[PDB]
Symmetry: C4
């Protein structure tokens, strides 16, 4: 309805922006496709909508929208549902396109990512490429060590990801501190295969 119109009017706004800045045709179409995969023809002022509600209704909503994500990921599926709800209410949906570098190996990490749908490639100068996909997560190491990205991560397909910031990642682990051990265990496993080890875990 008026969400279909909001999508349209917002995209025309994007169209005049690229017109104004004279971006090439291929870049414009790339932005067109992002816009279609990410919003799918409707646009919602989601912060304002859920802010009209209360905690229980918001929590009931995120749990419904993410049933598949929760169900297919053992970390969430077997955890205390209150831990899950706390994580879910802070996830932010993001779409990446084939070839995008989601994470660069040198940099500082400010967020981790949960793969709802898609394939990514884990890359280090000096090892092979492992694939991660639906039900998996990545970017957690830098969050735990407070260090620097131990690899680059690259979208292979269109990716529908849910991201979690370092602050919210930590606010949720102060609460429910048993769950940090669950993250470190897999992080230790993954480091041991990329020829790495680290005392901090």
């Amino acid at each position: 309805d008026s969400s279909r119109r909001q999508y349209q009017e917002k995209y025309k706004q994007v169209e005049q922006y690229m017109s104004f800045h004279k971006l090439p045709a291929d870049f414009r179409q790339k932005i067109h496709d992002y816009y279609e995969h990410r919003y799918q023809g409707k646009m919602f002022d989601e912060d304002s909508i859920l802010g009209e509600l209360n905690g229980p209704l918001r929590e009931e909503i995120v749990n419904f929208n993410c049933r598949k994500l929760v169900a297919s990921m053992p970390l969430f599926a077997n955890a205390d549902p209150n831990f899950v709800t706390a994580m879910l209410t802070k996830l932010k949906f993001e779409v990446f396109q084939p070839g995008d570098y989601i994470i660069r190996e040198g940099t500082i990490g400010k967020k981790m990512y949960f793969i709802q749908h898609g394939v990514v490639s884990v890359l280090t100068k000096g090892n092979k490429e492992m694939k991660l996909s639906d039900g998996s997560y990545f970017g957690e190491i830098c969050l735990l060590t407070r260090g620097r990205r131990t690899a680059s991560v690259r979208a292979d397909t269109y990716c529908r990801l849910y991201s979690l910031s370092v602050d919210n990642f930590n606010e949720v682990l102060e609460e429910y501190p048993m769950m940090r051990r669950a993250f470190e265990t897999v992080a230790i496993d993954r480091l041991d295969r990329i020829g790495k080890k680290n005392s901090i875990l």
Copy 2:
């Protein structure tokens, strides 16, 4: 007028949101009813309205809207009206529905609640259920001990509540510090019946 229209257009926005995320029929009606109890057919950009005013007019307004809350609650009714005004200007109105868990026993507390209208149930694994209702308040213990919720609290009816955040709760007790003793006294009483005691009070 245009507040009746704002209610309508905002709710249709909510309607397309649940349509987009394919929520079941019972959940949609539950959200419909919340929306009717909480906004009652009109929607006001209340932050912007009261921000157009000045301190005295804002203070005169909250005191008028809350005469009954103040009058039926001894803590406010017999306190220094400036203490009351300071508390009132930071309360945030909230509606909960039957069955909602307002507070879960394990968690960290970030706010307390004043009952304008409604009945709630106080619940601990290992004690009976006490009811609280109009003129009463709850969630104050965690605010004082800076600890962890000593019980769960559950809406029995539709509840019209006014919430107060930990920060504002503390900003108002630094000012007017005699009023903290008033909170602790009742908190000590309530702990002594749920078989509990605590040195911090």
Copy 3:
């Protein structure tokens, strides 16, 4: 133009708010008059307008709008115009109505006030009433001592005031620290007449 319409539509929004909360007739008219003295039939999204500009244009604008305030107040009139400009760009315009208590004697101070037009009464339990008016300022003591209001201040007429917050008051005195001595001198004078003295000045 569309600022006259914005005034109208915004006020009708206020009208439905008081209708919804059933405020009495005298309080509604009091709010009507405030709205007319404060906005004078036009409403401007002033943060957004001046944010479209740059520093020099903003500084040239506040200096023009406040020529009279600056010219009739020795503190500003003889100060370094850069000090003045720094103060001016942080002033916030406020209107008070006869009888309003602008400052209550017990409380914590978070701002001071510069009188563009109007008369106020300085009040302490145990002294006479001094009047301040156009070209004068007040609320500065608590800002300097970081203490507690040494008196109440009460609008006698409609007052057009410019307020300055404690933070901005301090950001401007770290810069230009010679000007704090100018404030303390008058504050020491005013304390000595209300039978008071204070070491911190």
Copy 4:
């Protein structure tokens, strides 16, 4: 399209603002010209547009819009493109008019400036005037010493500048710390000609 209309309606809003505050004719035209050089007939809610996108698309966009700035400025042109991208995503576009004092010699520095197009004059009481122009930058010293502006800087022509705040300047140099040495080297050179020296560099 609707960006051309947004320019128009926004400018009429500015027009009623100056009408309301009765600004003289020359000042109004000065604001008219600023508005034309700065927005060029179109207005975009740029924060919201780029916020609809993702990191890679935003980074690809700033890099395209600033190809000339990057290419003509050795500091950026020969640096690690990730350093550049980090700087670019935090630049804020600004237009200054002939005669404006961009930086005053006494003051505290909160930002530096990169000259996309324009000529400025570097001024100290007690030295000659050096000109800087396209491809050059200034305001970096105060950012490095955390001190006080070592000179005034004055627009000679219309200037199209990109500014960088002290915080973002520092967030980017914690990352990529080799680039601070590049700034200090030129800062040391520039100080040595204005008869100055400083241990902190």
